[PDB]
Amino acid sequence: LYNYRQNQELKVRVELLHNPAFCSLATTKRRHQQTVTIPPKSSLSVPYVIV
Protein backbone atom coordinates (compact mmCIF):
# COMPACT_ATOMS: atom_id res chain seq x y z
CA LEU A 1 0.00 0.00 0.00
CA TYR A 2 1.44 3.35 -1.14
CA ASN A 3 0.39 6.57 0.63
CA TYR A 4 1.62 9.91 -0.76
CA ARG A 5 -0.21 12.55 1.29
CA GLN A 6 1.83 15.25 2.99
CA ASN A 7 -0.11 15.51 6.28
CA GLN A 8 -2.61 12.68 6.77
CA GLU A 9 -3.12 9.32 8.47
CA LEU A 10 -5.15 6.54 6.86
CA LYS A 11 -6.93 3.57 8.45
CA VAL A 12 -7.86 1.22 5.62
CA ARG A 13 -9.59 -2.12 5.09
CA VAL A 14 -8.04 -4.73 2.80
CA GLU A 15 -9.89 -7.71 1.33
CA LEU A 16 -8.86 -10.65 -0.84
CA LEU A 17 -11.66 -12.24 -2.86
CA HIS A 18 -11.78 -16.02 -2.94
CA ASN A 19 -11.43 -18.32 -5.94
CA PRO A 20 -12.36 -22.02 -6.30
CA ALA A 21 -9.06 -22.76 -8.08
CA PHE A 22 -7.13 -21.69 -4.95
CA CYS A 23 -7.31 -22.77 -1.32
CA SER A 24 -6.92 -20.22 1.47
CA LEU A 25 -8.57 -19.13 4.72
CA ALA A 26 -11.39 -17.37 2.82
CA THR A 27 -14.43 -19.56 2.14
CA THR A 28 -17.78 -18.68 0.59
CA LYS A 29 -19.42 -17.75 3.90
CA ARG A 30 -16.50 -15.89 5.50
CA ARG A 31 -13.76 -13.90 3.76
CA HIS A 32 -10.53 -12.16 4.69
CA GLN A 33 -10.84 -8.65 6.14
CA GLN A 34 -7.83 -6.78 7.53
CA THR A 35 -7.65 -3.33 9.13
CA VAL A 36 -4.31 -1.49 8.96
CA THR A 37 -2.92 2.01 9.51
CA ILE A 38 -0.58 3.77 7.07
CA PRO A 39 1.90 6.46 8.17
CA PRO A 40 2.12 9.52 5.91
CA LYS A 41 4.36 9.41 2.84
CA SER A 42 5.13 5.73 3.22
CA SER A 43 4.38 2.13 2.27
CA LEU A 44 3.06 -0.98 3.99
CA SER A 45 3.30 -4.69 3.20
CA VAL A 46 0.70 -7.43 3.65
CA PRO A 47 1.45 -11.12 2.92
CA TYR A 48 -0.96 -13.81 1.70
CA VAL A 49 -0.66 -17.60 1.45
CA ILE A 50 -1.93 -19.64 -1.50
CA VAL A 51 -2.05 -23.28 -2.60
Partner: protein, 249 residues
Protein backbone atom coordinates in the same frame (compact mmCIF):
# COMPACT_ATOMS: atom_id res chain seq x y z
CA UNK B 1 -1.13 -9.98 15.62
CA UNK B 2 2.52 -10.71 16.45
CA UNK B 3 5.46 -8.34 16.81
CA UNK B 4 9.17 -8.55 17.66
CA UNK B 5 10.72 -7.08 20.80
CA UNK B 6 12.75 -3.92 20.23
CA UNK B 7 15.27 -4.65 22.98
CA UNK B 8 16.24 -8.07 21.64
CA UNK B 9 16.53 -6.75 18.08
CA UNK B 10 18.80 -3.96 19.34
CA UNK B 11 20.93 -6.48 21.24
CA UNK B 12 21.21 -8.70 18.15
CA UNK B 13 22.17 -5.77 15.91
CA UNK B 14 24.77 -4.66 18.47
CA UNK B 15 26.56 -7.96 17.82
CA UNK B 16 29.12 -8.65 15.11
CA UNK B 17 28.66 -10.44 11.77
CA UNK B 18 25.02 -9.31 11.59
CA UNK B 19 23.67 -6.01 10.29
CA UNK B 20 20.21 -4.49 10.73
CA UNK B 21 19.11 -1.42 8.80
CA UNK B 22 19.00 1.91 10.63
CA UNK B 23 15.58 2.62 9.11
CA UNK B 24 13.98 -0.38 10.84
CA UNK B 25 14.82 1.04 14.29
CA UNK B 26 12.43 4.00 13.86
CA UNK B 27 9.63 1.57 13.00
CA UNK B 28 7.62 1.56 16.25
CA UNK B 29 6.42 -1.92 17.20
CA UNK B 30 2.87 -1.47 15.89
CA UNK B 31 4.03 -1.77 12.25
CA UNK B 32 6.71 -4.48 12.08
CA UNK B 33 5.15 -7.00 9.70
CA UNK B 34 8.38 -7.91 7.89
CA UNK B 35 12.01 -8.07 9.00
CA UNK B 36 15.19 -8.34 6.93
CA UNK B 37 18.65 -9.39 8.13
CA UNK B 38 22.02 -9.30 6.34
CA UNK B 39 24.54 -12.04 7.11
CA UNK B 40 28.25 -11.57 6.43
CA UNK B 41 28.98 -15.28 5.96
CA UNK B 42 27.60 -18.73 6.74
CA UNK B 43 29.76 -21.69 7.72
CA UNK B 44 29.70 -24.81 5.54
CA UNK B 45 30.58 -27.25 8.36
CA UNK B 46 28.46 -26.43 11.44
CA UNK B 47 25.21 -24.67 12.35
CA UNK B 48 25.45 -21.10 13.66
CA UNK B 49 22.17 -19.34 14.35
CA UNK B 50 20.09 -17.08 16.58
CA UNK B 51 16.69 -16.79 18.28
CA UNK B 52 14.35 -14.09 19.54
CA UNK B 53 11.01 -13.56 21.26
CA UNK B 54 7.62 -12.60 19.81
CA UNK B 55 4.84 -10.72 21.62
CA UNK B 56 1.11 -10.54 20.90
CA UNK B 57 -0.81 -7.26 20.97
CA UNK B 58 -4.08 -8.25 19.28
CA UNK B 59 -6.46 -11.24 19.37
CA UNK B 60 -7.39 -12.61 15.94
CA UNK B 61 -9.02 -15.94 15.12
CA UNK B 62 -7.63 -18.23 12.39
CA UNK B 63 -4.08 -16.91 12.47
CA UNK B 64 -2.08 -17.34 9.26
CA UNK B 65 1.30 -19.12 9.33
CA UNK B 66 4.57 -17.24 9.04
CA UNK B 67 7.38 -17.51 6.53
CA UNK B 68 11.18 -17.51 6.47
CA UNK B 69 13.28 -17.13 3.32
CA UNK B 70 17.04 -17.16 2.77
CA UNK B 71 19.25 -16.67 -0.29
CA UNK B 72 22.46 -15.17 -1.67
CA UNK B 73 22.76 -11.75 -3.27
CA UNK B 74 23.89 -12.47 -6.83
CA UNK B 75 21.82 -15.64 -7.39
CA UNK B 76 18.12 -15.10 -6.62
CA UNK B 77 16.62 -18.24 -8.17
CA UNK B 78 18.34 -20.45 -5.57
CA UNK B 79 16.62 -19.82 -2.24
CA UNK B 80 15.18 -21.76 0.69
CA UNK B 81 11.78 -21.16 2.30
CA UNK B 82 10.09 -22.56 5.40
CA UNK B 83 6.87 -22.12 7.37
CA UNK B 84 5.81 -22.40 11.01
CA UNK B 85 2.72 -22.33 13.23
CA UNK B 86 2.15 -23.01 16.96
CA UNK B 87 -0.81 -25.41 16.81
CA UNK B 88 -0.08 -26.92 13.37
CA UNK B 89 2.65 -29.40 12.48
CA UNK B 90 5.17 -28.13 9.89
CA UNK B 91 2.95 -25.14 9.07
CA UNK B 92 1.44 -26.83 6.01
CA UNK B 93 -2.26 -26.17 5.47
CA UNK B 94 -4.83 -28.96 5.72
CA UNK B 95 -5.79 -30.89 2.59
CA UNK B 96 -6.63 -34.52 1.85
CA UNK B 97 -5.82 -36.48 -1.33
CA UNK B 98 -3.81 -39.13 -3.18
CA UNK B 99 -1.04 -37.94 -5.49
CA UNK B 100 -3.09 -36.48 -8.38
CA UNK B 101 -5.69 -33.86 -7.42
CA UNK B 102 -7.75 -32.74 -4.44
CA UNK B 103 -9.80 -30.10 -2.65
CA UNK B 104 -9.05 -28.79 0.84
CA UNK B 105 -10.86 -28.98 4.16
CA UNK B 106 -10.54 -25.59 5.88
CA UNK B 107 -14.20 -25.77 6.90
CA UNK B 108 -16.52 -26.93 9.69
CA UNK B 109 -17.77 -30.43 10.56
CA UNK B 110 -21.59 -30.17 10.49
CA UNK B 111 -24.45 -27.66 10.70
CA UNK B 112 -25.71 -28.09 14.28
CA UNK B 113 -34.69 -29.95 15.20
CA UNK B 114 -38.46 -30.10 14.73
CA UNK B 115 -40.73 -32.15 12.48
CA UNK B 116 -41.56 -29.50 9.88
CA UNK B 117 -37.91 -28.46 9.52
CA UNK B 118 -36.98 -32.04 8.62
CA UNK B 119 -40.00 -32.24 6.32
CA UNK B 120 -39.10 -29.08 4.42
CA UNK B 121 -35.34 -28.85 4.01
CA UNK B 122 -34.88 -32.50 3.04
CA UNK B 123 -36.61 -31.62 -0.26
CA UNK B 124 -34.08 -29.01 -1.39
CA UNK B 125 -33.18 -29.14 -5.10
CA UNK B 126 -29.56 -29.69 -4.07
CA UNK B 127 -29.60 -32.80 -1.89
CA UNK B 128 -29.15 -36.11 -3.69
CA UNK B 129 -29.17 -39.07 -1.28
CA UNK B 130 -31.18 -39.83 1.85
CA UNK B 131 -30.12 -43.06 3.57
CA UNK B 132 -30.33 -44.85 6.89
CA UNK B 133 -27.27 -46.88 7.83
CA UNK B 134 -25.81 -49.16 10.48
CA UNK B 135 -22.19 -48.53 11.44
CA UNK B 136 -20.18 -51.74 11.05
CA UNK B 137 -16.59 -50.62 11.65
CA UNK B 138 -14.31 -47.66 12.36
CA UNK B 139 -10.65 -47.13 11.45
CA UNK B 140 -8.48 -44.20 12.51
CA UNK B 141 -5.37 -43.12 10.63
CA UNK B 142 -2.96 -40.21 10.25
CA UNK B 143 -4.28 -38.21 7.29
CA UNK B 144 -7.99 -38.83 7.97
CA UNK B 145 -10.35 -41.27 9.67
CA UNK B 146 -12.62 -43.72 7.89
CA UNK B 147 -15.92 -45.39 8.70
CA UNK B 148 -17.43 -48.46 7.04
CA UNK B 149 -21.23 -48.56 7.17
CA UNK B 150 -23.99 -50.86 5.94
CA UNK B 151 -27.18 -49.68 4.23
CA UNK B 152 -30.57 -50.95 5.43
CA UNK B 153 -32.80 -49.40 2.75
CA UNK B 154 -32.50 -46.68 0.12
CA UNK B 155 -35.01 -44.12 1.38
CA UNK B 156 -34.18 -41.68 -1.44
CA UNK B 157 -31.62 -42.81 -4.01
CA UNK B 158 -29.48 -40.50 -6.13
CA UNK B 159 -26.98 -40.73 -8.96
CA UNK B 160 -25.03 -43.53 -7.29
CA UNK B 161 -26.79 -46.90 -7.54
CA UNK B 162 -26.76 -48.98 -4.35
CA UNK B 163 -28.73 -51.97 -3.10
CA UNK B 164 -29.57 -53.27 0.36
CA UNK B 165 -26.67 -55.17 1.91
CA UNK B 166 -23.84 -53.19 0.32
CA UNK B 167 -21.12 -51.40 2.27
CA UNK B 168 -20.10 -47.75 2.06
CA UNK B 169 -17.01 -45.77 3.04
CA UNK B 170 -17.00 -42.38 4.78
CA UNK B 171 -13.94 -40.13 5.04
CA UNK B 172 -13.55 -37.39 7.63
CA UNK B 173 -10.88 -35.04 8.99
CA UNK B 174 -9.42 -35.67 12.43
CA UNK B 175 -10.89 -32.51 13.97
CA UNK B 176 -14.43 -33.88 13.56
CA UNK B 177 -13.65 -37.00 15.63
CA UNK B 178 -14.80 -35.35 18.86
CA UNK B 179 -17.72 -33.68 17.10
CA UNK B 180 -19.50 -36.74 15.69
CA UNK B 181 -19.22 -39.03 18.76
CA UNK B 182 -19.86 -42.26 16.86
CA UNK B 183 -19.71 -45.73 18.42
CA UNK B 184 -19.97 -49.34 17.30
CA UNK B 185 -23.28 -50.98 16.34
CA UNK B 186 -25.63 -48.00 16.12
CA UNK B 187 -28.16 -46.73 13.59
CA UNK B 188 -28.17 -43.31 11.94
CA UNK B 189 -30.03 -41.48 9.18
CA UNK B 190 -28.16 -39.12 6.90
CA UNK B 191 -28.47 -36.91 3.85
CA UNK B 192 -26.01 -34.82 1.87
CA UNK B 193 -25.49 -32.92 -1.36
CA UNK B 194 -23.91 -34.05 -4.64
CA UNK B 195 -20.63 -32.09 -4.55
CA UNK B 196 -19.21 -34.39 -1.84
CA UNK B 197 -18.60 -37.41 -4.08
CA UNK B 198 -14.91 -38.32 -4.24
CA UNK B 199 -12.95 -40.86 -6.21
CA UNK B 200 -14.49 -42.31 -9.35
CA UNK B 201 -16.29 -45.37 -10.69
CA UNK B 202 -16.73 -47.60 -8.83
CA UNK B 203 -14.80 -46.78 -5.63
CA UNK B 204 -16.96 -43.78 -4.81
CA UNK B 205 -16.68 -42.31 -1.33
CA UNK B 206 -18.67 -39.75 0.64
CA UNK B 207 -17.24 -36.80 2.57
CA UNK B 208 -18.69 -35.54 5.84
CA UNK B 209 -18.57 -31.80 5.18
CA UNK B 210 -20.59 -28.91 6.56
CA UNK B 211 -23.80 -29.55 4.61
CA UNK B 212 -24.14 -33.29 5.27
CA UNK B 213 -26.49 -34.07 8.16
CA UNK B 214 -26.36 -37.23 10.29
CA UNK B 215 -28.75 -38.00 13.15
CA UNK B 216 -28.92 -40.86 15.65
CA UNK B 217 -31.80 -43.34 15.43
CA UNK B 218 -32.94 -45.39 18.46
CA UNK B 219 -33.46 -49.13 18.29
CA UNK B 220 -36.87 -50.35 17.15
CA UNK B 221 -37.68 -51.68 20.63
CA UNK B 222 -37.42 -48.21 22.19
CA UNK B 223 -39.82 -46.28 19.97
CA UNK B 224 -42.32 -47.31 22.66
CA UNK B 225 -40.41 -44.94 24.98
CA UNK B 226 -40.91 -41.18 24.72
CA UNK B 227 -37.18 -40.50 24.25
CA UNK B 228 -37.58 -40.29 20.47
CA UNK B 229 -41.02 -41.83 19.91
CA UNK B 230 -42.23 -38.51 18.51
CA UNK B 231 -39.25 -38.51 16.16
CA UNK B 232 -39.78 -42.23 15.50
CA UNK B 233 -43.28 -41.77 14.07
CA UNK B 234 -42.24 -38.45 12.50
CA UNK B 235 -39.53 -40.12 10.43
CA UNK B 236 -41.73 -43.13 9.75
CA UNK B 237 -44.40 -40.84 8.31
CA UNK B 238 -41.70 -38.92 6.42
CA UNK B 239 -40.35 -42.14 4.88
CA UNK B 240 -43.78 -43.45 3.89
CA UNK B 241 -44.71 -40.01 2.54
CA UNK B 242 -41.69 -39.97 0.23
CA UNK B 243 -42.22 -43.62 -0.75
CA UNK B 244 -45.96 -43.29 -1.44
CA UNK B 245 -46.40 -39.62 -2.36
CA UNK B 246 -42.96 -38.05 -2.76
CA UNK B 247 -42.50 -34.33 -2.23
CA UNK B 248 -44.62 -31.37 -3.42
CA UNK B 249 -42.15 -29.81 -5.87
Amino acid sequence: GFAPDTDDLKQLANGVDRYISKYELDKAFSDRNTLIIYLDKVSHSEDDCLAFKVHQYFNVELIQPGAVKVYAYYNLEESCTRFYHPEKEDGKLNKLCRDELCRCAEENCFIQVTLEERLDKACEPGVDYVYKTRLVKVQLSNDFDEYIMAIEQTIKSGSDEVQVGQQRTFISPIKCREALKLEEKKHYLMWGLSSDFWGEKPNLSYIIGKDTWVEHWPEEDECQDEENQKQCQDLGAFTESMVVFGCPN
